[PDB]
Design a binder for this molecule. Structure first.
Ligand SMILES: N=C1N=C(N)c2ccccc21
Ligand SMILES: N=C1N=C(N)c2ccccc21
Ligand SMILES: N=C1N=C(N)c2ccccc21
Ligand SMILES: N=C1N=C(N)c2ccccc21
Ligand SMILES: N=C1N=C(N)c2ccccc21
Ligand SMILES: N=C1N=C(N)c2ccccc21
Ligand SMILES: N=C1N=C(N)c2ccccc21
Length: 330
């Protein structure tokens, strides 16, 4: 089996990407944030506290003839950005881009935090990290990819995120027309439940490549690129007027700037993030100070290759017995 679905930015800044997912019988289509940094498939639902729903599409299990309540099971997650959600659990049929899993755990939100309520574009999350991070208790559940893997032509999925444009998630096959050159594969540690790998270094603009090991995670659910303070300082030092703002919470720069590219290493290969990908626009409406797309990881304890980095590449999440990651230019 295979599946293929289009993923679309939620807004003009690429703050996140949504992908349509069919749940239940008859199908209920929700637009989910595919998140390689977490392992729960959770949705706004008919059970979500009414005051916490504001424009999202909801899953109604009582209208699905294949939904079954998972007795006594609950879930609760808190994310790196401070947001959270929790609820009960059903099993149901879930399809992505033509690929179907029966008996998938669908985590129905009873409560969501304000940031989720305030974002009408995201109907839930579809976690694609390793199932060891799944939060369902007392019986932990498996991700959509884990459940699908044995049925797939190849035990892989690929992320091809667009820059201010749609892109694609594929399951079970590698579209060799979607990238240029070759795919460079690199080792993954699953010990923390993430797609955790080690970049071989970086360059700023046309500058000299610095060979240095940078351990981090490939996380489609994080918007920005979070790297060590030394690396981030070296990047923003090339932008006149850029500075780290405590009040804003990161590096900001004059909106009139044209930003340098940022290169990261994958083995001997190099992925180049164009400068414009690092511009996240005015810090507040009408401001001429703009928010940077490369920020320090110092206060979060892990480096994160989020969408800013991943959307510059075609990325293979290889879920074979020994997982690996692949990156190609595109
Ligand atoms: N055999 C069953 N498995 C499940 C279920 C739900 C309700 C009635 C019977 C069953
Ligand atoms: N790797 C596995 N994860 C779980 C499971 C159930 C049945 C067969 C193989 C697996
Ligand atoms: N055969 C399997 N391989 C894996 C997996 C996950 C969940 C159910 C069955 C399987
Ligand atoms: N800060 C986040 N990191 C994620 N991987 C994620 C997923 C969904 C909401 C917020 C976040
Ligand atoms: N989307 C934009 N709106 C602007 N006024 C602008 C200036 C420079 C780059 C991108 C943009
Ligand atoms: N006013 C802008 N200046 C920019 N550099 C930019 C980027 C994206 C959206 C809006 C703007
Ligand atoms: N955390 C942020 N602070 C901002 N002013 C901003 C703009 C665009 C994306 C993310 C952020």
């Amino acid at each position: 089996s295979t599946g293929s679905a289009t993923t679309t930015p939620i807004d003009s800044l690429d703050d996140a990407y949504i992908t349509p997912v069919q749940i239940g019988t008859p199908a209920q289509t929700l637009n989910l944030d595919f998140d390689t940094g977490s392992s729960d498939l959770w949705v706004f639902s008919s059970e979500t506290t009414a005051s916490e729903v504001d424009g999202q599409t909801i899953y109604t299990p009582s209208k699905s003839t294949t939904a079954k309540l998972l007795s006594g099971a609950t879930w609760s997650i808190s994310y790196g950005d401070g947001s959270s959600s929790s609820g009960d659990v059903y099993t149901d049929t879930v399809s992505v881009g033509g690929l179907t899993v029966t008996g998938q755990a669908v985590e129905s939100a009873k409560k969501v935090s304000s940031s989720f309520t305030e974002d009408s574009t995201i109907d839930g999350l579809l976690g694609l990290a390793f199932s060891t991070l799944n939060t369902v208790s007392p019986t932990q559940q498996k991700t959509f990819f884990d459940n699908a893997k044995a049925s797939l032509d190849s035990p892989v999925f690929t992320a091809d995120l667009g820059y201010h444009a749609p892109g694609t998630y594929n399951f079970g096959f590698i579209d060799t027309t979607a990238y240029t050159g070759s795919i460079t594969y690199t080792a993954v540690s699953t010990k923390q439940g993430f797609w955790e790998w080690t970049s071989t270094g970086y360059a700023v603009g046309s500058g000299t490549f610095k060979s240095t090991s940078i351990d981090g995670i490939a996380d489609t659910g994080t918007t920005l690129l979070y790297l060590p303070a030394t690396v981030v300082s070296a990047y923003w030092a090339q932008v006149s007027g850029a500075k780290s703002s405590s009040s804003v919470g990161g590096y900001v720069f004059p909106c009139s700037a044209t930003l340098p590219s940022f290169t990261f290493g994958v083995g001997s290969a190099r992925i180049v993030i164009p400068g414009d990908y690092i511009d996240f626009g005015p810090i507040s409406t009408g401001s001429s100070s703009c928010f940077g797309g490369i920020q320090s990881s110092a206060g979060i304890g892990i480096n994160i290759f989020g969408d800013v980095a991943l959307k510059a590449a075609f990325v293979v999440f290889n879920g074979a017995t020994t997982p690996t990651l692949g990156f190609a230019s595109k």
